[PDB]
Amino acid sequence: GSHSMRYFYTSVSRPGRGEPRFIAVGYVDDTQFVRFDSDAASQRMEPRAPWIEQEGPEYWDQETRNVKAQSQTDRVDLGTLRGYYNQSEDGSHTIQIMYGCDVGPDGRFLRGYRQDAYDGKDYIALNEDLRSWTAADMAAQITKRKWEAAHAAEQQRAYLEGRCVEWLRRYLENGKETLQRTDPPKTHMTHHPISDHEATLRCWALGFYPAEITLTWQRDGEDQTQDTELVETRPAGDGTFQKWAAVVVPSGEEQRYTCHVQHEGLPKPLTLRWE
């Protein structure tokens, strides 16, 4: 299976206090493995997964230095962007940065990406060729000019095709007991009557990893979208994920509906019916 590594960076500007907050998390696939907070006392990148703890001083040292540099770049650009939008100096504003790289089971580099946002809207993106940018506003056009005239995509593509994949391969070997495992969904189905003639059938998937899963309700073997309810795949805090889907069915017909479950850890899709 393919495996990714993505880093997430939030900077929000705090006018009253006067020095913005900076939160950075690192995920391998769906398993966060590091973190950095600007108001926390530690002021260093902190392991959040056991298999990265083995890396020594130099790794943590270099990572903290680079992330602090990113924090200061974000602060300055928050200042520049409040100008590009002619915005109040009173208000608080967010800059978000996500970037990462995807390698396949062969281990070979598959793709790279780097997207930047302001105030929850797309600001600028690295295009799929890693040498063109797609700005989303006129202010972004200003940024592209400076970036295009600085050949920043070169540095982003050197990192994305370079250190990013090498290190994700190192991490995937360091934690292969947990990063390449596939805990299959544990499924079960509940029955809650709602009227004398209506009942709800709810279909449960628990304890699965990775977080990708597909729950489907089919009435008489045809996919049912009306009278369905599916909830957002949620974490458990043990490193697995949970999901349920549900349908309101008439009375006496509970056996004309079927829950279909697709996930990696199931080699053939599973079917569930109220017995």
């Binding site: 880093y7 990113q70 650009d77 970037y99 600028i124 600085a150 920043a152 250190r163 290190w167």
Partner: peptide, 10 residues
């Protein structure tokens, strides 16, 4: 790891 030195201004 994280992206290395950049200093890329917006």
């Amino acid at each position: 790891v994280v992206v290395g030195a950049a200093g890329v201004g917006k």
